[PDB]
Amino acid sequence: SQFTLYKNKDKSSAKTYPYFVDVQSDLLDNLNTRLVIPLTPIELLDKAPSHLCPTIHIDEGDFIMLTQQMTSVPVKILSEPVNELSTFRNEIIAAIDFLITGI
Amino acid sequence: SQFTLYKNKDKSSAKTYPYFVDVQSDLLDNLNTRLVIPLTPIELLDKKAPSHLCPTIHIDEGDFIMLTQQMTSVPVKILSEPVNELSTFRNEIIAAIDFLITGI
Amino acid sequence: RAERWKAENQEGMAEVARFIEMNGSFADENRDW
Description:
The complex is a heterotrimer, with 2 copies of chain A and 1 copy of chain C.
Chain A: E1 4-7, E2 19-22, E3 33-41, E4 55-58, E5 61-65, E6 71-74, E7 81-84, H1 89-101
Chain C: H1 2-8, H2 10-23, H3 26-30
């Protein structure tokens, strides 16, 4: 379920961050937490560094992945899976690479 | 600063997470947030943590487990008290993060 | 020229930072510790 897209059920952040993607390896699914990265509507943001904030074009809309807001969350809040972003797996992981290596 | 160790000033979480290490590239130090990973004392552990994901870190402050899976973005404001530098563990820290997101 | 890269991307980063300040941070509200 790495790269699975989830609807944000946290009311206090759902408007700005309607979705988040699980970026954690399936090999470690025994953990009770998940590393995720939130998505924000592109029309709600007025041009972030492309290498750090990949653009996501999906059925749900057009979003910017805020890699700099990546965080560990309880597996409990992954309650509503709606899509998957495996087609963007390399762009997503590359953004994390960039966050950590500057390359 | 990447691999700099900071003391957790938050009294509520300082016990379980005494320190956190900055793992964010210095290239991005203009960001007002930092990707960090908390360290937990080995003396508080109930079970052994997988070493490939959670490397043991031996430093002056003591022996700790790097809780890589709890890596999170925090405001640069909480990086207020640097106490050590973990650059010598660079390779394993990076490999731990890479493992978390690749299973390799 | 790491410094020039930073310089060039300053405004891009600043805009994002102001965006998160004005719209809230996902990490802070969902962090598990």
